[PDB]
Amino acid sequence: NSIIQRISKFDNILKDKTIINQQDLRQISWNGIPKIHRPVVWKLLIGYLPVNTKRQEGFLQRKRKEYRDSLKHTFSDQHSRDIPTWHQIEIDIPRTNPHIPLYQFKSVQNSLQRILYLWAIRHPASGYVQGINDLVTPFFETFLTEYLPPSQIDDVEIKDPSTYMVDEQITDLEADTFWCLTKLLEQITDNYIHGQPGILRQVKNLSQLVKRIDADLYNHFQNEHVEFIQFAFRWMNCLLMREFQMGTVIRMWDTYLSETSSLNEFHVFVCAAFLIKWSDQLMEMDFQETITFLQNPPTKDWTETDIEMLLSEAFIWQSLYK
Questions:
Q1: Which of 20, 167, 169, 310 is at 20 to 30 A from 196, Cα to Cα?
Q2: Do 56 and 67 fall within a single domain?
Q3: Which DSSP symbol is given to 301?
Q4: How far apart are CA 103 and CA 140, in angstroms?
């Protein structure tokens, strides 16, 4: 399974086939998608780009035009709680992914501002919710790589998009990111409506799962008064993004998108397997040590092997439970 060979396998699935076979694509993508293919494959797996290649050009033109029109319509046109929401998002943008240079560029901040604003305006039941600013980034960053030479994809996090893309392309990127973010969130809608009932349910599900497979760890938490919400809310709210390096998050998403192409369900098992990995270590920690540890897991040097192992385990656990 050489890197070059793998790229070729995806090429024959994606090119010169007229109608792309979703089944074949999901099967191979589960084990990781070559970076050069992520933009296209992610859009196909999430249900944005149509599998019939003959319908893609028109589809994109219409979707990208719709994004533009919607944004134009939502600007100084109506008289709603618009402005306030815009400022609420303005407060979080500059503070998103402070450890990654890409996110401090003004072009990036303005692009994310528009994307999140439009989604927020289109979802009154949720409005803008902290956490969505994190979820939009893996899509934004991955889709951005399609505009760079393949040999420079590894530098997407340090280059200003306005230095290699014209305004029209940045808007196209914004549209694709927006529609894909929309498709993602539609699978976990109640995770973000007021009161975030979906997240509370997820945390309860994780709590019950752990009580099931590791009663000793569960009992230790009780004795040390460790509540799952104290560390798992963030795990659920940002889909574990705040617990891993972006490269690891991107790789994880290849599998999440392939597996759900059931998001909440699969995520709960990944969280359980992640937690259980630290079980022995956690058994020797008190409240403060535990919270500090779970909000700052030692995943800095995780490799493809580490991530692949976690996902594979979560898949087996989920399969057994069903």
A1: 310
A2: yes
A3: T
A4: 10
